[PDB]
Design an enzyme around this catalytic site. Structure first.
Site, PDB file in Angstrom:
ATOM      1  N   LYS A 168     -88.633  60.101 -22.742  1.00  0.00           N
ATOM      2  CA  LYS A 168     -88.743  61.457 -23.348  1.00  0.00           C
ATOM      3  C   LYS A 168     -89.996  62.211 -22.832  1.00  0.00           C
ATOM      4  O   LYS A 168     -89.968  63.463 -22.828  1.00  0.00           O
ATOM      5  CB  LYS A 168     -88.759  61.316 -24.868  1.00  0.00           C
ATOM      6  CG  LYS A 168     -88.673  62.637 -25.619  1.00  0.00           C
ATOM      7  CD  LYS A 168     -88.962  62.475 -27.066  1.00  0.00           C
ATOM      8  CE  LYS A 168     -88.805  63.772 -27.832  1.00  0.00           C
ATOM      9  NZ  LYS A 168     -88.629  63.502 -29.277  1.00  0.00           N
ATOM     10  N   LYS A 195     -80.012  58.021 -26.834  1.00  0.00           N
ATOM     11  CA  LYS A 195     -78.965  57.280 -26.024  1.00  0.00           C
ATOM     12  C   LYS A 195     -79.593  56.251 -25.162  1.00  0.00           C
ATOM     13  O   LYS A 195     -79.135  55.090 -25.166  1.00  0.00           O
ATOM     14  CB  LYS A 195     -78.149  58.249 -25.172  1.00  0.00           C
ATOM     15  CG  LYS A 195     -77.368  59.142 -26.113  1.00  0.00           C
ATOM     16  CD  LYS A 195     -76.307  59.906 -25.350  1.00  0.00           C
ATOM     17  CE  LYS A 195     -75.848  61.261 -25.820  1.00  0.00           C
ATOM     18  NZ  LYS A 195     -75.610  61.508 -27.261  1.00  0.00           N
ATOM     19  N   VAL A 251     -59.092  64.638  -7.842  1.00  0.00           N
ATOM     20  CA  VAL A 251     -58.259  65.245  -6.770  1.00  0.00           C
ATOM     21  C   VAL A 251     -58.871  66.581  -6.381  1.00  0.00           C
ATOM     22  O   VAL A 251     -59.140  67.436  -7.265  1.00  0.00           O
ATOM     23  CB  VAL A 251     -56.798  65.425  -7.210  1.00  0.00           C
ATOM     24  CG1 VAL A 251     -56.001  66.066  -6.095  1.00  0.00           C
ATOM     25  CG2 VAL A 251     -56.160  64.113  -7.602  1.00  0.00           C
ATOM     26  N   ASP A 280     -69.421  64.085   2.799  1.00  0.00           N
ATOM     27  CA  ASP A 280     -68.632  64.990   3.692  1.00  0.00           C
ATOM     28  C   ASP A 280     -69.560  65.576   4.764  1.00  0.00           C
ATOM     29  O   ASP A 280     -70.874  65.454   4.598  1.00  0.00           O
ATOM     30  CB  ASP A 280     -67.812  66.035   2.895  1.00  0.00           C
ATOM     31  CG  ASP A 280     -68.557  67.269   2.372  1.00  0.00           C
ATOM     32  OD1 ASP A 280     -69.760  67.292   2.525  1.00  0.00           O
ATOM     33  OD2 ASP A 280     -67.890  68.211   1.892  1.00  0.00           O
TER      34      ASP A 280
END
Ligand SMILES: Nc1ccn([C@H]2C[C@H](O)[C@@H](COP(=O)(O)OP(=O)(O)OP(=O)(O)O)O2)c(=O)n1
Ligand SMILES: Nc1ccn([C@H]2C[C@H](O)[C@@H](COP(=O)(O)OP(=O)(O)OP(=O)(O)O)O2)c(=O)n1
Ligand SMILES: *CC[C@H](OP(*)(=O)O)[C@H](O)COP(=O)(O)O
Ligand SMILES: [Ca+2]
Ligand SMILES: [Ca+2]
Ligand SMILES: [Ca+2]
Length: 326
Positions: A51, A63, A94, A181
């Site tokens: 934190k 969490k 996709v 990519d």
DNA sequence: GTCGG
DNA sequence: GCTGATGCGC
DNA sequence: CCGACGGCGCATCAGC
């Protein structure tokens, strides 16, 4: 990786918020927290320790405490088990299926890879290509293949006009050992912020790469941006290389530095740098850095003669591309 | 979800 | 056809 | 507490 458990937890939460909740600011909050924790050079022992980092607040600290005590997060445990979440998280892998299309497909009972292949008539051009190359687009590109790809694009562009310069940007320019990519920044002296003296400047390069069977498919194309599919040639008796994503962006030649800063990223680095510029009273896009008037109206473009000049305006020490990754 | 005014 | 909104992308 | 959160290209579609 150090704190890899936490950063994976935060990335899964970010993707849920983007894909399922359609909550873009929570998506960006989780990613900004993942990125700051990934760079932190100690093994995090508590949420209170986390934190202290900028972008980690009360809710992520909580969490992290759950994850450190139990090794899991009940919220993610439930999301994994939920059929609609699961279905949407899969469909959004996709290319061309975003959060809105994924939920619409789930409504129509289209939820698995087999449902997509039964329903090609319900997909647009982009989605059809996304589905064809679903497995290939999952795979990363080794740096060794990226160098081969660079050599083809740079040599084919020189064959079209010796005055083009093509620069491979993205994770490749940040020195990554693998890339998701290929991203190619293109300039030509005929296209500046003052004039387009020649039509078809991006088209002629796309056409040449199609001609030599490097570009295999088109997802989208305009005057300045191509998004498509490419493939390395393979030798006799060899398995083909996977099909790869390629992006080409034609940037005005006089705005190369703003453009190479943009295209080098990372995306999280760009958001951080552009938010810092606003705090400093500037706005950065891929073309210019401009001051903001009190009004919140952007003034005239500032002179830029290096990537580093952009960092100097916003009073950041220069970061080489390799230090702009998460 | 987080931060700064 | 044009314009503005929205989706999905970098 | 609450407004802001990076900035923009191309595809698609509604309203005129
Ligand atoms: N939301 C985004 C996405 C991308 N970009 C910019 C910075 C990225 O470096 C570049 C290319 O985007 P990619 O998604 O191809 O990302 P990378 O090349 O960084 O990573 P990968 O290895 O996954 O391709 O475009 C950005 O400014 N904002
Ligand atoms: N069905 C709803 C729910 C919320 N809102 C509006 C009112 C608030 O501007 C905000 C959400 O209100 P909340 O009850 O979530 O809490 P606030 O943050 O508004 O409460 P407070 O003003 O006490 O901070 O959205 C609305 O118009 N219609
Ligand atoms: C992670 C906990 C959540 O933080 P954000 O404002 O998304 C909230 O505490 C709501 O909890 P949820 O019931 O887990 O969504
Ligand atoms: Ca890339
Ligand atoms: Ca890309
Ligand atoms: Ca931009």
């Amino acid at each position: 990786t150090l704190n890899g458990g936490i950063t994976d937890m935060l990335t899964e939460l970010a993707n849920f918020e983007k894909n399922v909740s359609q909550a873009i600011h929570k998506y960006n909050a989780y990613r900004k927290a993942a990125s700051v924790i990934a760079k932190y050079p100690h093994k995090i022992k508590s949420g209170a320790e986390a934190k202290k980092l900028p972008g980690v607040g009360t809710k992520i600290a909580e969490k992290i405490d759950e994850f450190l005590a139990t090794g899991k997060l009940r919220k993610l445990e439930k999301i994994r088990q939920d059929d609609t979440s699961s279905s949407i998280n899969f469909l959004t892998r996709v290319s061309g299926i975003g959060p809105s299309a994924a939920r619409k497909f789930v409504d129509e009972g289209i939820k698995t890879l087999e449902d997509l292949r039964k329903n090609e008539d319900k997909l647009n051009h982009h989605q059809r290509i996304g589905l064809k190359y679903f497995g290939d687009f999952e795979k990363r590109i080794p740096r060794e293949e990226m160098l081969q790809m660079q050599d083809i694009v740079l040599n084919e562009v020189k064959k079209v006009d010796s005055e083009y310069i093509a620069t491979v940007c993205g994770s490749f320019r940040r020195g990554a050992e693998s890339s998701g990519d290929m991203d190619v920044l293109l300039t030509h002296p005929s296209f500046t912020s003052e004039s387009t003296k020649q039509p078809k400047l991006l088209h002629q390069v796309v056409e040449q790469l199609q001609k030599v069977h490097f570009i295999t498919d088109t997802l989208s194309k305009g005057e300045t941006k191509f998004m498509g599919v490419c493939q390395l040639p393979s030798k006799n008796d060899e398995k083909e290389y996977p099909h790869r994503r390629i992006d080409i962006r034609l940037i005005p030649k006089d705005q190369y530095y703003c453009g190479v800063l943009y295209f080098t990223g990372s995306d999280i680095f760009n958001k951080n740098m552009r938010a810092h510029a606003l705090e400093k009273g500037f706005t950065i896009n891929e073309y210019t850095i401009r001051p903001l008037g009190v009004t919140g109206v952007a003034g005239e473009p500032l002179p830029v003669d290096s990537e580093k000049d952009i960092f100097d305006y916003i009073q950041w020490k220069y970061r080489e591309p390799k230090d702009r990754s998460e």
